[PDB]
Structure formats: structure tokens, C-alpha cells
Design a protein around this ligand. Structure first.
Ligand code: IMP
Ligand code: IMP
Ligand code: IMP
Ligand code: IMP
Lengths: 377, 377, 377, 377
């Protein structure tokens, strides 16, 4: 004797809980590739998915995409086009204060729908990174004069007295300026910098494609676990967090947001693009140099926390960011959420479900058992 | 002092339960390679093993083998020979409705023991895939006129309003037509499509050899876990499920069925065969193109959920399907079951036992510690 | 304030149990490489270690080494020299009954301390494999006439009516003949064949270096778990068990015995030796063919459960078996046991301790972080 | 409604415990790469970090670095420069007693801040290894006459009657001489040698880069677990322990100390340096031979417990040890500890937190997803 098909939806009530795991059940020491999001119910087109995201307490973007402050990723060209496509760029500071201020000016003075713009002047939004030593106070002053919208305090370990004092000084001196503090990977770190007055947090330590901090400092955290534990705390204070490092595809972006991130920062993915700094070279493939700011070369302009490498040409971000945007829309559709806001609410309520992945399951999830294969878009 | 050998069978009663794990104990997020079935008692020849399998509520096959609806796997030639060998083929729809209807006609009009045939006309059984948009209503009408026996609603995420409405429309318009809905990987998805009136379910998301949905959508499920959790629900309603994706050998077929699948769908395994579409080419090995329907090439005839690749020549299925058939018989024999029906009953009663496999155990289970090696059959 | 060194031994009493895990605590689905034995106390030289081992109820060897019944491992030459070095050889049956009987005769008629010899005639001990069909009754009769000491019922799944009847027939017809039944990997299998009257058991399914039974039959068990669970049962009846398959080094032998095996069977390790059948060939390395009896080539003299491969030349066993013997002595010394009998007693009492090994720990345990490396003995 | 940022630090009290795991919670069978230390609070410069370390009960070094007693690592040249840089060298004994005594004399007679020197004569500290057989009594006498400061009883399994008697003999004969016993990996081993009168312990079995003891003896322990369980016992008696083997980078040193080690011993890392014995050779890379003392070559001057290999040129330790020193300072800074003494106290109190690392997390922690990459310092 079999059950009547008409009672199929009702019979779900006989189960203790929904299939798969809630986020809390899921979250030891795992990262993005160690799990999946289970599909939900589709009753809308992907084009309907809204990807509006909080960068800081006062700044909201139309897309959760942020380009990393690295000298092989983000200068004026990257910051301009990232802003035009609904994200934002963080200009690096491996350069003179004069040079950095000039790059900010190029972004703010640029003229030509989802574009990231200031509410008042309708100029493109621009971010910039700085250190937390005394000399950077002057550097920031020059950046602010150039029209800086948001500053990122750049550090591998942001929970320091130096950064705390810098944050306090900025809020007091430049109250209209949004401050993103970091990097952090623990609840205690986040509380410290939130208490200091941070407008946003940057999450990650060692997860970068070119980073080896975990190998030389023995210090860091798996990215997935870091994002979850930090945001679970920080979101209670309305402090948006950037998931920074270890993002290589659309799936990582979805998972980063699922675990509590408001935006995601990318370095390696955008490194090979036309708009990134540095020239192309052949090896017979078209490559661009991509290096950690803690590498000997970058610091040269000593203990290295990063390495110098190369990545394949990815083409222009004018096609690559839309690919990520459309992809994330389709990802949200499969999960059954119409916005990142809804996605956040559904996850915390336990409606969105997750599943672990054994090493075998991970291999199964990718390409396998082929003689050869070639195309993301 | 040692125990008397005569009391050996009786002494088993002193143990709390049988050696190894029941299926429920076994079932986180694992797939086929993560476990094994423990051997049982052999008191019959392998030739006695019956492999009769339910494809849908009303359709039963002599073998649990289904060829996937892909343009590099199943057209008329594949569907004909699959049917002749006791399975069935699902004709792809990456073509005009006219072209697809012609391929169905070729199968139904073909003339020449275990063969899959309609009960009334004794014509070869034929399956076909369609989308769930309005234009497909017309396409299905043409397929039905050509003598279609079963339709597969083709989607990576089948739990949508569009597919639900399509299922309702088909049952109402073509009541004699069997409908397989999918793809699904969760209990909630299955309930939705069963409630809609599905005659069978297609299980899998991201597990395909050419699929990368898990990588770009962050959405899917390990195949083993998906089959178990879906069928544990669906079998209560007498809805047979196809285990689709990640099958590479006879062992995967056995495990798929063990975990609750009624039939298994194969794409990559049948791709390199003579009866599959596409021509052979040399690279110095004989290869055939095998590509996901979500690949840029297939869609071309945009976010790719599949990749284009190649597989080695496997020869004719006239020898390959019998190899799978005989192999599965021997597999059932080792386990100690005389049919797939008995296999299903024994597993759910806890008589058939399972065992996890550590990564070391998996390497041990395959070929290892040789300088070189060569032959499945 | 620190503790007095004089109280160091006494302070161990404050701990709930000894460091590491007992065997029961250790024993899911793991195999040899997944764990280690913890060192004990050395108060004796390695030369004092006795490696006497039970092959069957009535046969004891001076070394726990058995050569596998494969046509690329054991014929007369191997069986003779294995016996001379304190082990035993099992002659394969991929040949006519006449040919097999001749090989046994060569062993028993051979004339020239730890040597394995019959108690009465002082002839070298000899084993031989047979099938369990009717034709093998005649074959066994010819082997017995040639002076066979022990017969191995050769099968990948030994728990069958055919093997059970064969065992009953042999005990009744040739009461003086020792019977080793198998292969088995579960408690239920062992009870069945012990109840039938087996004098020893052969443990393993899929763990062989050339075996792929787990891949095609989905049936088998990780070797470590199989040895433990079978012997934990079988040893209660005084039935010695051979750990067959997956042995590649001295460490595997120690672990096999630790988990309850009385002897270990080797195929791949002895395949490349001078005394094995088959000629050497160059590829620029000296190799010998090594193949599973379930391979197409071996069966040829169809579903393959084994593959044909090659192994590097290992030299003569006149140097290789002493290497294993001395190595196992040193292994026992490190653990702090003076015999395999003591080793068995110490393990079951919980005195010998074990430790799991993460994948990282396994890599650490081998050679790592070198530019290159070369020598077992 | 969001929480007030001012209450961020106070809100931490609502959590049951600190983020991450205490060391006890962390500690199955894992090693260094299986975990990380979570970052703390920085309120000091790295230059302030003190790395003073106990080698034995009476000997303290300014740096926790010890060069291993291997004939491809430490002779007079290495021992001199290790001492000059605040560590110590252990001269190997794969040589005549006369030759070893001469090497010690070269170190003690050498003349030319953090340098490791005797308190009385201000001569460079020098260590030396010996065996535990009768002939070594004479050898030690010659070493002591040459001015030996500390002796290491060299063995893969130090818990033996021979070593116990040697320790007793040395304390009685040369009371002023510091004795390091080992190697050990269990609590029971440590208690035995502490009770015998050891002044320090050497931890490790099989973890060496050139060691294969675990593979051939089946005996050993994952290094991380060994260090923790041994030191948790030994530190109660004020017996410093050397973490010996498996150290490849600064991160391993930090973790070794975190788990309870007082100093770390390095062989492979220092093998390729200018000051190590053996000449350079090209293969087109500059290499030096590095081999285990249990290798056939080393023993030659038989069952091998080590292998012969090669490592890349690392340059002079005059630059490499400062790199490790500065790196470890920065590591301590990130964790938020001002000394190794504080680091030890903070870990045992549960203030320093840890995190597991899945295989995915480990890959993420290193370099990944690059076309190519190059520089530690
Ligand atoms: C450690 N972390 C470093 C370094 N340079 C940059 N970064 C960090 O990694 C992120 C990039 O990660 P991807 O996976 O490439 O996207 C950056 O945003 C930054 O957080 C370094 O040298 N050492
Ligand atoms: C995701 N899944 C895809 C795609 N093309 C086909 N398929 C799915 O995979 C199965 C084939 O799996 P194999 O392991 O090759 O046998 C198909 O039956 C279908 O379910 C794709 O582009 N993206
Ligand atoms: C499955 N098992 C097979 C086959 N030929 C031999 N054997 C089994 O494996 C053992 C050898 O294992 P090694 O790891 O090489 O020492 C044999 O003793 C036997 O039990 C086969 O074709 N399929
Ligand atoms: C086992 N252990 C051996 C052998 N030679 C040296 N050693 C051990 O390994 C340590 C070196 O480890 P690395 O990872 O290279 O730094 C030595 O200090 C010693 O404890 C051997 O032949 N077999």
C-alpha cells in the first residue's frame, strides 16, 4: 500500500525538521568548498533577484563586489569601472600619498542605472586603503580632499592599538567618512574594532590565493568559519562585513553571503582583467603579474607573508562583472530567494538548508572522469 | 579454552546487531565512493538474478539502465539499442520539435526477450526530454503523435512553478503519458513534484561528470545523500526515482540502487559508444565529444553550468550494456540478493549491511602500488 | 613549584587510562595506513623476538609469511623457498590438475632450522589453492596424493553453499588435510565457514593491489576493519586467520597482526622476486608482470575483477624474507613485545596502545619536503 | 533594531566561552598542518617579543632553535654559528670518538649579545649526541674533556633499559652534565626517562622529513599529538622538551611551542645551508645531500628506517636563523603574546584559541588558483 500523492505536501509535517542542515547546525574549521546550499522553490525569474548590499553603515551598493586594494588589482581604471558596474574599488597605497590622491581624483572627476554614486554630487563612489601609522594621517587628509568616500584600514591583523587609535582619530576628525576596519577573523577582534567605531569590517586571514600568513605566522582561520563567527556577532550591531580572500567563483560568493557576509572582496579573480594595473606578457599564454602586498617584490616597491605569481588573462570586467552578477541572480533563484536581504533572513530563520561535502563529494561536484575538457561564459 | 565450531552460528546471537552498518546508520554529505556494501550469503547462481526495475508508476524495465537526454549521448540510434537491451533512451531536445519528433518516430517504427516494448503494440519504448515553457506544449504534442511513451521534464532545478504547471497540464491533456519530473535532490522538492502528479523523479544536481553547477551556483547535493533522502520519501508514494549523474562503473549502479534508486541514468559512460551521436576523432586515441547541455557550445547549438570535453571510445553498447547487466547480477550475488526487489527489501529491513571508507580505504580498494597497469571486459 | 622526578612513575596513576587508544577504542571503515601502534618499553634485544605463527588449527609456522596463490607469484620455486625461510607457499590453480600436482610434488620431494616441515616426514610444507566446483574434487585427490599439507578454497566471496559443501566433503574424505576457507570480511561469513569445519580463514575483499572488486561489485571492506571484526570472532574458536591483501611493507604486517591476524598473505610484494613465475623484461627498468586472477588475461589462460600490471624487480626472497623477518622483530621490540603470542595478548588486554592518523599525519609519517630521494635494505 | 557599538565589548560576556577552541578542546591523531592559532590583541611591537627558551633544567637559550645531530646537518661549523645566533648545535656521532671530540673542541675554543655561552667561561655552548651502549661511556668521557655542555642520547625509541642505565650512569659520573633523553612520543615513555633523571626530553618518532619509521616499524605518533601529550606530563616536572621532526616553516615552530614544546629541532631546514657538512652539487639546481641516520648510506658510513635524499641550497644560517627569529616574533605579536613564557601561560589558561583545518581549509591557507608563483625572505 502506497501513500496518496495528494497528501505529499502534508506528509512533510511528519518529519522533525527540513531536509539538510540549518546554518547553525552546519557551523569544524571548514571553508567554502566544504559545503553546499540546498535548492529551494522557484516561483520567479532570475532577473527579479535584487543584489543590493551594504558596504558600510551608510553606504549601500547595487552589487556585493569589491576590488581588493592591491597594486596588481585596483588603481583608478579598476575603481572607475567597478563603480560603473554597481560595485566599488579600493585603491591601494603601495605608492606616494600624492599618487594615491591623484588616483582618487581621477575616479571622482570621471564623467560619461546601477552605478555606484554619491547621493549628493552623483560622482562615482571611491574607496582607498591606508596604513595605521602617524604618517597616514596626512595621507588620509589628502585622500579626503580628493573626495574619498570610504577608507579601508589595511592590515593582516587589524585588532591593534594603532588601528583602534586611527579609527578613533578618523571618526573625530572626518565624521562624514566611512571607515572599514580589519582584517579580523574572530568575535573578539570584531568587538574591539566595532567598539572603536568601525563602519564596516574586513574578514580574512591567510585565505588569499597569494597569501601564506597561515604558513609563516601559524595564525589565521578558515574563511567560511571566520565569516560566520564574525558576522554572527557584527550583524547584531548593523556593521556590514566584507568577505575578503579565497573567492574564486560565483559559488564562493553565494556561500560567503550565505554565511553572513554583506559584500565580497576579490583580488585574484580581477587580477587578470584589462582594467587591472600591470602589463600583459606571454608564457604561450597571456598572463598578468599577481602578487601579495606582503611579498618581497611588493614591499620592495623582512619576512614575506605573500608571494609573487601570475594569472591568466580574464578579459575586461565590463563582461566579467555582469557574468558574476547574472550568475549570482541564478544562484539566488535556485535557492529560492528574491534578494540578498531575503537570503540573509531565510538563512537565519533556518529556511535555507545546507549540506556537508566529503572529499569524494567535492570531486563529484566538479568535472571528473574525462579525457579532456575546456568556458565559464 | 576455545569455543566449539558447532556453536559458531548460534554465537552470533550474543552480538547486539549484525556486522557493519544498516543503511539508516550509514546515512554527512557522502556519495558513492564513500562507502561499500558488505557481502552476504551465496546460495544461487548469478544468472538467477532478476534486474527488473520501475522507471515510472506504470512502466517497468528489464534493466535499470537509462541513457541521458544529451546531444552527445542519446538520439534515435541510442534509444533503439537501449530499448533492445532491456533499458530505455531519453531523446534530447537540443533540436527543433520536428527533428525530435522524427527521432521518436524512428524508434517507434523500428522492426527487427528482455527488450523494452509497449504492452499493446509491441513497439520499442521511447523516452524524450522537453523544457517547461509554453512553446514546449506544442513540442510535446508532436512527440506524443510520434508515439512517445514517457516524457522527462528537463531541468537542473525542477522544483519550479513552471514545471509544476507543465506536469498538471500534461496529466490533464495526455493522461496516458508517463511524466518524469526533476531534477531534485531534497525531500521538499520531491513532495512538490509528486503532489503535482509526477509519475517518476529524476535525482541529481552537480554530480554529473561534465557538470559544474555546484561550483557556479553553490547549489546541489552529494549524489549518495540525495538519492537516499529523496527516495526514502518518494518510495512511500510508489514513485520510482532515477539516480542521475556520477555513475562511472557497475559499483556505482549497485550503490545507487542500494540507497533507494529504481533506475540509474548514464551520460558519460555511454558517450564514447558507437551508438551515441557525434563522430570519432583522434588525439593518438579515439575520442568522442561529450558536453553538458549547460555548456556554451550546447546552448550555442550566458552563465555556463557545464563544460565541453571528450571521452575515450567505449565500443558498441551491444557489448557494454550486457557487461553492466552481468556485472550487476554478480554484484547482487555477492550481496546475497536474487532480485533488485529483494535488494530493496533487504536494505530497508537492515539485513544488507554497509561500511564507510576512509580516503586510505578508497585508495586500497582500487589499483595501487604498481609500476603500471592496463581491461574492464 | 614542580613535581619531584622520583614520583614520575607513580604520577601515571592519576590518569584515567594509558596514553593513546586501546584496540577496541580504535575500532569507521579504516585500514592500515589510518593508524599507528604506540611504542612501549624495550628491555630485550630484537633477536629475542619469536615470530611463530598459526596458519591453521594444526599447522604452525616460524614466520607469519604466506605467498599468495597467483600465477605471477607462487609456483614450485616460490613454495620451496618460502618454506625454507620459515613461511609457506600456496600454489595457484590456473593450470591443469596434472600440472598443479606436479608442482606440489616438486616441493614435497625437494631435499637439500626455521624451515617449515612436516612433523613426521620432515618434508617441506606445501599449500595449494582449488575451486569449489565438482571437478575440483578430483583435482584435490591428485594434490593430496602428491603430498599436499593444506588446501585453500580460492574465492573472492567464500561464504557460499558450494564452498560450504566442499569444506564438509574434504573433512569427511581427507580428515588429515587442513582446510583454509575464504575469502571473508564479515563476522557472519566467518561463522558460516567455521561452522562448516574450516581450519583457518582467509581475510580480504578488494584490498589487493591489483584488485578492483570494490569498484565493480560495490562489495568488500577496508582491510583493517575486516581483519579486526573477523578475527575478534574467529579467534574465540581458535581458528587462525590470514590477512590477505593490501600489505606493502613491514608496517602493514605488524598492524595486520596487531588487529588479530595470525599470518599475512602477500602477492604484489613477492611478485617482482627471482623465485616468482614469469620472465623479467625492461621498460629502462627491470619488471615482472603481476596480474589479478580475475583479470581478463589470467582468466583467458566476462566481467573483470582484477587488472594486469607490472612491478619492479625485488631481487631474491632469500634476502627479502629475512628483511621482513628482521624488520618485524625490530617492530615488536619498539612496541615492547617478545613474541607474536605476547603481542596478541597485550593488544587484547589494552596494554598495547594505538593512535589515529589524519591525512596530514600520514604525509608527515612518510618522506616529505625533499627535492629528491632514493633503499629499504 | 541594532545593538549600540559602545556595548560591543560588554556583549562578549553573553557568550559561553571565547571564539575558537582551547588547546585541551583541540587535543584525533593530528599534527601541525591540521590546525591554526587564532589571532589576539596587538598592543606592542614585534621587536619587544622575547624568545628565551629552556633547553634543559639548567640551560636556557635566547632562541628555541636546535640543529639536529645528523651528519648532513651539524658539525663544528653549524654548532658554532647556531650558538652565535642564540641557539645550539648537537654534533652527530656518525664518526670516531676522537673525531667527535675534536669537533666539540673546535666549538668550545672558538673566539671572535644573544650568543649562547656558558655562564662561567663565556665559551660557546655545545651539544653532542651519543649511543647508549658500553663503548659510548668512553666516548662521552672524551667529549666531556673537550668541554661538552649537554649530551643527547640518540635513539628512535629512547624508552629502553640501555638508555635508562646510561642516564643513571651519567648523572652519577658527570653530575654537572645536562642529559637530554629520547626519542619519546608517549606519556609512559617520558615518565620512565624523567624518573631515570633526564634533564630534558626529545620528542618525535617518524615525523622527520627523511624518516620512514612509521612505514617499516608501524610505530610512532603524529608530531602535534606527541608534543602535546608528552609535554602536558613533562612540564609538570619542569623538564623542557625538544619538538624534533616535521618542522618545515616558522608556523610549525609556533605550533610546536603552542602545544608545549620548549625548543624545536631542525634537520631538513638547515641541511641545505652553507654551514652544514657536505659539498654542493648541481641537478640545474644547487643541492646538498640530506639523509636519515637510519639510511643505508649513513649506517654504511640491515633494515633502513631512513632514506637518502637532497634539498635545495638555503644559503647561510647567518641570514636564515634571523629570518626564523624575526618571523617567530611577528607570529607571537599576531597572537598577542610578548614572550614564549607568556605564550605558554596563555595557552594553558585557555586565553590563546585554536581552530581545526579541513583539507580544503589547508589548501586555502596556502597558495592556490595561480598559473605560477615564486621568496620566503
Ligand atoms: C596575506 N594576505 C594578502 C596579501 N596580499 C593581499 N592579501 C589578502 O588577500 C586578499 C586577496 O585574496 P584573493 O583570494 O586573491 O582574492 C586581499 O584582499 C587581502 O585581504 C599578502 O601578501 N599576505
Ligand atoms: C549540470 N548537469 C548536466 C549538464 N549536462 C548534463 N547534465 C546532468 O548530468 C547528467 C550526466 O552525468 P554523468 O555523470 O555524465 O553520467 C545528466 O543526465 C544531467 O542530469 C550541465 O551542463 N550542467
Ligand atoms: C580481486 N582480488 C585478487 C585478484 N587476484 C588476486 N587477488 C587477491 O588479492 C591478494 C593480493 O593482494 P596484494 O595486495 O597484491 O598482496 C590475493 O592474495 C587475493 O586475495 C583479483 O583479480 N580480484
Ligand atoms: C627516523 N628518524 C630520523 C632519521 N634520521 C634523522 N631522524 C630524525 O628526524 C629528525 C629530522 O626531522 P626533519 O623533519 O628533517 O627536521 C631528526 O632530528 C631525528 O629525530 C632516520 O633515519 N629515521
Amino acid at each position: 500500500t502506497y501513500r496518496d500523492a495528494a497528501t505529499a505536501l502534508e506528509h512533510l509535517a511528519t518529519y522533525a525538521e527540513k531536509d539538510g542542515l540549518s546554518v547553525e547546525q552546519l557551523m569544524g574549521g571548514l571553508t567554502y568548498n566544504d559545503f553546499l546550499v540546498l535548492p529551494g522553490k522557484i516561483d520567479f525569474p532570475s532577473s527579479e533577484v535584487v543584489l543590493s548590499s551594504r558596504l558600510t553603515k551608510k553606504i549601500t551598493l547595487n552589487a556585493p563586489f569589491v576590488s581588493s586594494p592591491m597594486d596588481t588589482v585596483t588603481e583608478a581604471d579598476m575603481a572607475i569601472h567597478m563603480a560603473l558596474l554597481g560595485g566599488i574599488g579600493i585603491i591601494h597605497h603601495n605608492c606616494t600619498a600624492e599618487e594615491q590622491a591623484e588616483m582618487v581624483r581621477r575616479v571622482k572627476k570621471y564623467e560619461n542605472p546601477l552605478a555606484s554614486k554619491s547621493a549628493d554630487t552623483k560622482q562615482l563612489l571611491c574607496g582607498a586603503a591606508i596604513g595605521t601609522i602617524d604618517a597616514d594621517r596626512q595621507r588620509l587628509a589628502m585622500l579626503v580632499e580628493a573626495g574619498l568616500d570610504v577608507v579601508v584600514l589595511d592590515s593582516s591583523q587589524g585588532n591593534s592599538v594603532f588601528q583602534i587609535n586611527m579609527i578613533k582619530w578618523i571618526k573625530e576628525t572626518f565624521p562624514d567618512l566611512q571607515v572599514i576596519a580589519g582584517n579580523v577573523v574572530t568575535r573578539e577582534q570584531a568587538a574591539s574594532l566595532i567598539h572603536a567605531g568601525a563602519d564596516g569590517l574586513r574578514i580574512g586571514m591567510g585565505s588569499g590565493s597569494i597569501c601564506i600568513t597561515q604558513e609563516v605566522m601559524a595564525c589565521g582561520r578558515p574563511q567560511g568559519t571566520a565569516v560566520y563567527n564574525v558576522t554572527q556577532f557584527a550583524n547584531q550591531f548593523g556593521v556590514p562585513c566584507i568577505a575578503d580572500g579565497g573567492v574564486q567563483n560565483i559559488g564562493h560568493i553565494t556561500k560567503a553571503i550565505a554565511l553572513g557576509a554583506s559584500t565580497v572582496m576579490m583580488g585574484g579573480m580581477l587580477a587578470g582583467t584589462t582594467e587591472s594595473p600591470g602589463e600583459y606578457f606571454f608564457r604561450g599564454k597571456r598572463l598578468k603579474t599577481y602578487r601579495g602586498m606582503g611579498s618581497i617584490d611588493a614591499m620592495q616597491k623582512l619576512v614575506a607573508q605573500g608571494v609573487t605569481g601570475s594569472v591568466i588573462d580574464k578579459g575586461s570586467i565590463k563582461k566579467y562583472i555582469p557574468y558574476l552578477y547574472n550568475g549570482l541572480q541564478h544562484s539566488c533563484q535556485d535557492i529560492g530567494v528574491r534578494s540578498l536581504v531575503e537570503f540573509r533572513e531565510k538563512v537565519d530563520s533556518g529556511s535555507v538548508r545546507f549540506e556537508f561535502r566529503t572529499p569524494s563529494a567535492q570531486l563529484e561536484g566538479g568535472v571528473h572522469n574525462l579525457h579532456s575538457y575546456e568556458r565559464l561564459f
